[PDB]
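Worked example (supplementary).
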Amino acid sequence: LKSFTVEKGIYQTSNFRVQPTESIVRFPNITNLCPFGEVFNATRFASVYAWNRKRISNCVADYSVLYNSASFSTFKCYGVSPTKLNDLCFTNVYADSFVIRGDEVRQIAPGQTGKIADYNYKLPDDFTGCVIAWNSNNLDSKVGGNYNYLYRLFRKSNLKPFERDISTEIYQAGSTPCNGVEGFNCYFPLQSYGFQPTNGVGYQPYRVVVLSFELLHAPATVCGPKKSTNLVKNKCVNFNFNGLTGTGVLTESNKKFLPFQQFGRDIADTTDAVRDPQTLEILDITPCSFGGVSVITPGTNTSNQVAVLYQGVNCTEVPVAIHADQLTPTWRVYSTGSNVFQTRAGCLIGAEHVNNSYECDIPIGAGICASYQTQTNSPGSAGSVASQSIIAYTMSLGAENSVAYSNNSIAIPTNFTISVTTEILPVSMTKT
Amino acid sequence: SFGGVSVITPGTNTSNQVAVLYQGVNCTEVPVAIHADQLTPTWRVYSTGSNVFQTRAGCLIGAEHVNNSYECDIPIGAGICASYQTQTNSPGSAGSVASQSIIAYTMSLGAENSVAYSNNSIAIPTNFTISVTTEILPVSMTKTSVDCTMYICGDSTECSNLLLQYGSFCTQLNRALTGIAVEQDKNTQEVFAQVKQIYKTPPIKDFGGFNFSQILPDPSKPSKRSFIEDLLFNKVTLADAGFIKQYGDCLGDIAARDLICAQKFNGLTVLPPLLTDEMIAQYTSALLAGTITSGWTFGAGAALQIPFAMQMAYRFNGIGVTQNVLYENQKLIANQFNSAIGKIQDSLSSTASALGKLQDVVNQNAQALNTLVKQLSSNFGAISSVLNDILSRLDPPEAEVQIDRLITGRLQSLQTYVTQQLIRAAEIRASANLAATKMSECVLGQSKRVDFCGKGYHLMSFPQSAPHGVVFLHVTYVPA
Amino acid sequence: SVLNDILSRLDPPEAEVQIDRLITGRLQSLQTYVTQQLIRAAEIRASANLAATKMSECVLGQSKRVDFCGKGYHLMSFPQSAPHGVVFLHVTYVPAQEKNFTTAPAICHDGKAHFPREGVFVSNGTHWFVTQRNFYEPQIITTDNTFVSGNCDVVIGIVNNTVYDPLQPELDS
Amino acid sequence: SVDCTMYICGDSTECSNLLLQYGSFCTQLNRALTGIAVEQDKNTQEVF
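After joint prediction of all chains, the assembly is encoded as:
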């Protein structure tokens, strides 16, 4: 009101709102995981020059295991946060697994040059993806030496990103025709790596897997895992189902959804009942309790005791809305007590319900009216301050009456009154 | 050349064949619009030929003009009206015959009646009729209240901050609707509350033969409400009742099947009316009670019991027909009136359309809210319609600009809603004041104003409660 | 929020954007205000028309409309000035005290029916009187007051009574 | 009577799509004017 004095009436001071208890994040069931195991825990590894490329798509790819696992020496992701993979989703993912020397491991990164980067396996400058590598001295190395892995010494030109060249043909360095065989100025294009268990760290063969994540407009097939929580019902909660979010009280519904259909909809175009991704249950949509708060007070000149009306709410929510149990005992009294009256309009606290009907001083709603009344017994005294209180009652329509209707009688007045009343009407506004 | 197109549909219930109106266009242009060159030859017939009638309003196709004059069912414009009629048909049996079509004709003002005006002749009615008509007026609207913050910002701290920059827009809007809300309560009080004391009818019904039983509240049925009004509640669509909705029952994608619940979601609340329906009936009972037993006196001050038969003697006195008319034909008049009362019951029961005005009151209001609700889906220029996504996807620096667009749109929408709301309320108020005057003058006394109380020298009226409105049963005198 | 600040603060190329924000908003506020006034003005003008009618009907004459001039059979009104409005001091007739009486729409002198020209039939219990509607004054029911219409058979409620004829005493005397 | 579409967007598809983003502002406005349009006729019938 922006005033120190308040005239009697009902005023809307603020808004009542139940706060959310907890946050729920959800994504669909975990099944249909991409086969990471085939790549990482693979029995055999391809060579650097021709590396294995397994496309991963149509799954929920759970990166967490690779990030968390100790087994890998390094795990570096250029384009996106390595932590982010669980949330992020890519249209297509390619895994390039190859075995290369330890010293060379650094080369597997964007914007790099070297034997692998140029000739072997090239990465885009822009490359978005993560490179995971680990040692395989135990697996790959041979005492005799493991020749199986080759890289390329010569080529007509530099290799483009992700371009692999398997070709066995003899490279002709010079003018002399090779004719398929080595000779002067003719060499097999690839050289092997001599890995042996005895060698040093740099020397050790390492299995590296790079997960490129091509991002296109096209539908994204490979998305991250689902970090979900338990479902709680009959409570105002902050829920996040697959696509949407909102706050309300999830309850069991009696709705029969079609097998394919995920969400319902209001006539209005609202989110009404949703199907839980984990359980095939239909849960109907309810905004959490809230309503207006109106203060019913007598004029400040008369008193300062008030009564509050919580519109369109049950009395039950008010003790829960605030943590009454948590609060001090001074605060506790306000939450519940005999002095609570519930009406159609809402829960009115601070006013005692009264059987007697009187004229309506202040309108509450639903026919209930509040007034400040005290019965007073004092000689030559107006109702003085005493144990006064605020009462709410069904507003009296007035003293009820009846007319002695009959076939044969009339009521004709003997005398009358000349009265004067005032009728007031506005004529004009101020000429602004 | 361009103009609006209107479809004259006789009604799907009745027929599929329709007529199309091209407003303010010459008929010559119609074939060019349609791809006559491209389309099949079946289509070719549809564009050209006779069976095209040119009117001031535009070019009308599908309708056959008729010289004969009829009353106007559906207005075309410029006095032309369209209707679906069948020419004489053969007997009803399978046989090949053609009938039923859409006709456009020159609307008839009605049947011309020349009057034999003369030097010294008078027409003096030998017999009369006590008929009854129904007049329906809206009294109040649904006390809608809207929270700006939830509507615009609904649970978004980042949003509300942006709203504050707007200053006082919300406070006034919330204030405006609240002002409207009180006014409705004021409307209902002024309309019904005309009487201080609440009268109840005596156990004896002997009303000179007049049969009130339909109009009086029926002690019995829940709510002491009357029979005729009971149908009235039935004909209308109550928004909701009970004012209690199970929270849990509500939470997901289905509850918005329950529209009110959805409304509950977006800050849209419906305040209840101060005067409850049960309470409203009592007034209607009282206003009715004093009118029956006391005459007009209850408006002036203390109600004075007067036998009903006596009242008509006064009421006839009001029109310029002496008392002798009533008693001399007391039984008939009562019978006429009682039979008259029954007619409303069938008319009311027969067609929903009797209630059309009230229904309108509900419907525009329903429309306003839904339109208000739907706006939430509009992007306006915004990247998306959901507040969370903007926050989620975009950094605040970028987001602030985006949300701002969304804010202006809804705020504009609410602004359109309230402005629209104020005007309709005013429309209602004038009606309410009109309603109050009708109870004040017509019910509480007998009105002198010709064509105020229904066609005829007005006798009296009995109000009946109705949703957000009131129905009057004007009993008028008409010469037979 | 200050125009002079923005002007002092920014060069025109940049300032134009900021000022534009205020103009669209402020104008919109002003637009809001005007719409409110038009609507509100309509309400007042509606009242003015009513006021004029009240002045027209109530002051200038005695209005017949029940509850137009205040509760009761309206006598008259005295308009009074006021700020931005008017106040009327209606003078209304309200019945104060009442007494029950027994009524019947007519009386039979001859076996014929009499109805009251002005008034209704009542009885003190001993004798029948006919009086005006809103203030009790009994009168001796004479032919001068009553008019003929029909006979006793049709009447409903009619009671036997004696009507006084002023003429007889003149001729007999 | 006023169609928003021409009045605003008049034969510009690029314009009209941008209009749709606006939602129901038009359909409501056109509705009101139509409602207004019928109203006068109602007035005339009531009077005469």
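Two points are worth noting when inspecting this output. DSSP finds 15 helices and 14 strands in chain B. Chain B touches chain A through 69 residues (CB under 8 Å).
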